């Protein structure tokens, strides 16, 4: 097996399939995005960037809807990306579904880090920047959505990964053999072992300065599973208690029976 070539293949699949990556994000964050820091600038950004949405419910529920729309888009990109991981498409369709069901929000929050800095995050395909303080200012429970993801991102970004690392990390998130309900655990474990081996060797080559980077990222995978469990609980509270905050059907299917 050629593990350098496998790493390149997964990186190329990531560059093709994701509209946002860390290179693109950093170009934008380096200074154009419309800055959303208060209700006036939220409403202005909505009229330009999501006009049909405001052509109205509470601002918090509009933001929640925009968040979900981004997730739906990213799930679609993740499904196409997954098709490129060796062995993934040879799995039973039911196992492909299970792996994606549990893995997509761990991958979403990992990749979200690339558009975040300590002051805010890119939104709407890089055409908006919403401040972290504005999101904290929203009424409960909506102000509790993003802050844990910023906290994860600040530590994740301190690892100084590049897109070649992240592509492999996202592939390893998707190929977890301990998801509930898998049929062919043995084949998935071997697929995972192979991707994790590619990740290990890549980090050794690309980050010779950080000899613990691989176990740091194994821990981040475990942190992400916990972040997703907590996020799913918050989504359930919102769904149950906020009638205007409908869930998109693909996201309802993902969250249903997850944790």
């Amino acid at each position: 097996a050629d593990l350098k070539s496998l790493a390149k293949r997964i990186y190329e699949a990531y560059l093709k399939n994701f509209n946002m990556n860390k290179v693109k994000a950093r170009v934008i964050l380096s200074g154009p995005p419309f800055v959303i820091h208060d209700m006036e600038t939220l409403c202005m950004a909505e009229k330009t960037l999501v006009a049909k949405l405001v052509a109205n419910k509470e601002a918090e529920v509009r933001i929640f809807h925009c968040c979900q729309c981004t997730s739906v888009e990213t799930v679609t990109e993740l499904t196409e990306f997954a098709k490129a991981i060796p062995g993934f498409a040879n799995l039973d369709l039911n196992d492909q579904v299970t792996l994606l069901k549990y893995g997509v929000y761990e991958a979403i929050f990992a990749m979200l880090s690339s558009v975040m800095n300590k002051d805010g995050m890119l939104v709407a395909y890089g055409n908006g920047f919403i401040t972290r303080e504005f999101l904290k200012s929203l009424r409960k429970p909506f102000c509790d959505i993003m802050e844990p993801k910023f906290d994860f991102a600040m530590k994740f970004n301190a690892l100084e990964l590049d897109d070649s690392d992240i592509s492999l990390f996202v592939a390893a998130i998707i190929c977890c053999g301990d998801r509930p309900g898998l049929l062919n655990v043995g084949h998935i474990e071997k697929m995972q072992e192979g991707i994790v081996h590619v990740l290990r060797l890549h980090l050794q080559s690309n980050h010779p300065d950080d000899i613990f980077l691989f176990p740091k990222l194994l821990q981040k995978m475990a942190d992400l599973r916990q972040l997703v469990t907590e996020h799913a609980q918050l989504v359930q509270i919102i769904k149950k208690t906020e009638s205007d905050a409908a869930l998109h059907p693909l996201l309802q299917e993902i969250y249903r029976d997850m944790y």
């Binding site: 679609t76 499904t79 369709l93 492909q96 579904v97 069901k101 299917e253 249903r256 029976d257």
Partner: peptide, 10 residues
């Protein structure tokens, strides 16, 4: 149980 995912995956 996941008709949209199933459809996206095909």
């Amino acid at each position: 149980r996941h008709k949209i995912l199933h459809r996206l995956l095909q």
